[PDB]
Amino acid sequence: GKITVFAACSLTNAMQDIATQFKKEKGVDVVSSFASSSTLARQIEAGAPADLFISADQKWMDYAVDKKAIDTATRQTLLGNSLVVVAPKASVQKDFTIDSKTNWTSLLNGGRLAVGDPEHVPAGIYAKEALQKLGAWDTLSPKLAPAEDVCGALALVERNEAPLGIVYGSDAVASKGVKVVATFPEDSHKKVEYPVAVVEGHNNATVKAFYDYLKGPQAAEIFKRYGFTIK
Template sequence: MPRFTARHPLRVLGVGLALALGVAAVPAQAEPDAEPKVRIFAAASLTDALNTAIERFEAGHDVDVVPVYASSSTAARQVARGAPADLYFSANEQWMDWLGEQGIELAERADLLQNRLSLIAADDETASFTPGDGTPLSELLADGERLSVGDPDHVPAGIYTRQALESLGEWEALAPRLARADNVRAALALVERGEAPRGIVYRTDALASDRVHELGLFPLDSHPAIRYPVALIDPPADGAAEAFRAWLGSDEAMDVFARFGFEAAGAER
């Protein structure tokens, strides 16, 4: 069955209604001077960097790029349910794999960026703390305090967090004390507002906030590599989505991402 019917049920319904009423169904057309529009569904941790990258791209191209940010899991589910997305930019490979398993055609898929997992605090009482150095992370939490994380059941940052804590032998002690957020930016916000004294987010999130500071990074071998794959999804024929996808892998775009703490996927550490 063509994917048109799955991704655009309201449009199909509109055509059928027009025919039933005896009215010619004429496809809506963009204004002659309207800019092509590209919709990208992206992980919340990409917000600041991708917004800046989009501004740079739009400055040199007559294209309107519209980002939609959510946890990678939420964004993937929205696309699978028919949300009008031209690209999907995930914070882990598993949700990109899942999207392909739902029958969504993924084109020009590639791992673009990589990140680190960071322990953060809202106060400056603890100058530094290296997870895995022998001191339990739970010692940073007083009685009744919780550790802010992306929900380990579906949010990539939370999934990496669980893997890291399991690797360090701290998951069982900390699992009951987690403040689970719907995405990594929500986990960051809990620490920024003082609702949780400590949190685990991506390093890029820690660097993006002036209300938290980074205590330390989790060991690279405590969890799988944090990679960000991107792919085209049923792009329109005008070529705008393909052009933006190609630009995202350019040196110009990588310079933007590097300013926000991202590294190119596969870069040596």
């Protein structure tokens, strides 16, 4: 009795604790592979035998679905999250409020904005989308420090290679080394939503019981503990 979950990077800590518990209360081992949702959707398209896939956006779930790789009837939106600007924990930067008059250059002071790569990384695509609506994207696009996932973007900031980054609400929570300094207004981007689905061919009673457990009160308590919103 062994389950494989492919989950967005941002779910690392939450998923590891759900797994350790599930094995404790159910005796089934859940082993996770974490990465950009783009990379994971691509692996699944390419035949990777994941049992479940949780994406950090709808876009990469839609992708896996339109490639016939998903048991589509099972797709549900599981989580919500906020999009935030982090600075390193030692930074003197204070909280501020984001709007179309936020002077991103002055805050950056010759530094880069750490982001998931907006070409594919959901955190980056949300960020691009907020920055465009805010009217700040053409100023910012040549000034990015892109990473291969939202964990890479966080780490640029932890290490002080970038003064600011855009990550999720939840990412600042699992990180000793950065502090949230602003939250994007919800009206600046598409809702950050995390769909889950059973991978095509893997809809069996063992996998179903874990899929049901991700909406269980034990998983809920952990998700919330890590700063996710429950759907």
